[PDB]
Amino acid sequence: SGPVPSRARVYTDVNTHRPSEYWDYESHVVEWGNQDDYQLVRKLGRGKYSEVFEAINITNNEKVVVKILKPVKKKKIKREIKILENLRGGPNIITLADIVKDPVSRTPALVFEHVNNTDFKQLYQTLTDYDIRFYMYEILKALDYCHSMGIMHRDVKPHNVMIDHEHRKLRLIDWGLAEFYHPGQEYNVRVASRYFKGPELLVDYQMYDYSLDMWSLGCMLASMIFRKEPFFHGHDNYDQLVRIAKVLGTEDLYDYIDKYNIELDPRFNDILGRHSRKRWERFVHSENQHLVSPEALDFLDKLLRYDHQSRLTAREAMEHPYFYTVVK
Ligand SMILES: Clc1cc(C[NH2+]CCc2c[nH]cn2)ccc1-c1ccccc1
Ligand SMILES: Cc1cc(O)cc(C(=O)O)c1
Known part of the structure; x- marks a missing residue:
């Protein structure tokens, strides 16, 4: 009888308990x-x-x-x-x-x-394993705070993250696509940027939440630690899900759509195919190995999950062993 409802596991009712003036x-x-x-x-x-x-x-x-x-x-x-x-x-x-x-x-x-932004295409080759951990934590501070304030950015990507490397200052920008989160609300899926779109958007599952941002952050982490930009290189919104399926596998994709009784669009019929679940280790190479570690892979594995509910929240992510080397 239509798709199964879902709600955020954290900050679920922050807007509900606030006066209309806020939201x-x-x-x-x-x-x-x-x-x-x-x-x-x-x-x-x-x-x-x-x-x-x-x-x-x-x-x-x-x-x-x-x-x-x-x-x-x-x-x-x-x-x-x-x-x-x-x-x-x-x-x-x-x-x-x-x-x-x-x-x-x-x-x-x-x-x-x-914000005095340091060059996107020049910062990529100089960043160390520590720098990635440091800046990922700075983005999580922004996301945990906005989610706590009942807001989903909905457009997390490298372009929307400004870094003043000299002063180690980071800013999350362009809140034009941002929305207030209300439990049970069915949002427009035409949000974010193709490579950063969560599986929930690609399968037209409208009752999404803050967890959408965590998927997008997972895409940025994968591109940085593996030096592969973008990580999921879709050519359109349907092909974007196929690129994800080529990594995450099609078995877990059907488990996701079955859990939420999602109707898969017929456009997926001839393109989805069948794909095994790849190990994160297969993306490690000579050019990126100095940025990869078991902690980085375990953290990435916990963000890049089809099931938006199974992804770490920004606060759970901040507690991950990957950030033990950074100041909280
Ligand atoms: Cl290395 C890096 C570069 C950027 C590019 N920011 C410039 C966007 C811009 C240019 N003009 C206007 N806006 C964003 C994020 C990262 C990043 C990603 C993962 C982990 C650590 C850092
Ligand atoms: C400071 C800054 C730079 C920029 O390129 C866009 C924004 C925004 O919030 O859209 C803010």
Whole structure:
């Protein structure tokens, strides 16, 4: 009689026990400040619906990041602002400093603390086993905090993680896809980035939770310790599940869909095939061995599981032997 319901194993009712003012973003009143305070310096990147700039705040001569948003959907903008305000000051959460609109354009813009990001393609070959453990723990601080505040980031990936390596500072950014978690709620599965999409999204299982973020974090860990980017290289959303099945095996995939009475889309019929469960050790090679250890593999095995409920929570992950060498 349809799919089996599911709920988060942690922070299940945090939004339920809070007043609507906290989670009802649509009713949130946004106050837009004048944008004359900030002068744009240079473009940092372009999003599908946003443009990010490095900027100078004239009042204090301090660098800031300005995210100009193309207002395609008003509700989405309110959701990001509300979530940013709720999380403001949390560990490793990007800090929303201001919300402004340009006097003439009236286009929405978010102003953030500046983060001096070290090069994505240059950091990959210098990081040691310790650095990966250190930065993975910094991301877990952000995720445990946001999940505790009843929020799912829903877009965890390397692009959304800013690292100032010189100051060992990490920030989880772009909360545009983030959502409040309400037990029993059926969310839109068209979230995250293809390579980081949890099996729950790919099989159209809508009653997902914070555990989605842990799958995405598992994908990032696998790419880093094995030097294989992305780890699961799907060419489309259906092929993405096949790439996962080629590693995790098809037997555990059917156990997952049977546990939640998920109806597998017919598009999977000719592409899924049959795949044995691979051992994590088979991804170890001369180029990545210095980043791999039994602890790293045991930790990875506990994140990359079809069953979202069987994945470690951010707090359980922080207690893993893989992080015994890092300061808590
Ligand atoms: Cl090595 C690394 C690099 C990045 C890239 N961040 C730049 C994104 C960006 C560029 N421009 C705007 N945003 C993110 C995460 C990691 C990472 C992953 C696993 C474990 C430790 C670290
Ligand atoms: C500090 C920073 C940089 C960036 O590229 C985007 C954001 C965001 O939150 O989308 C924030």
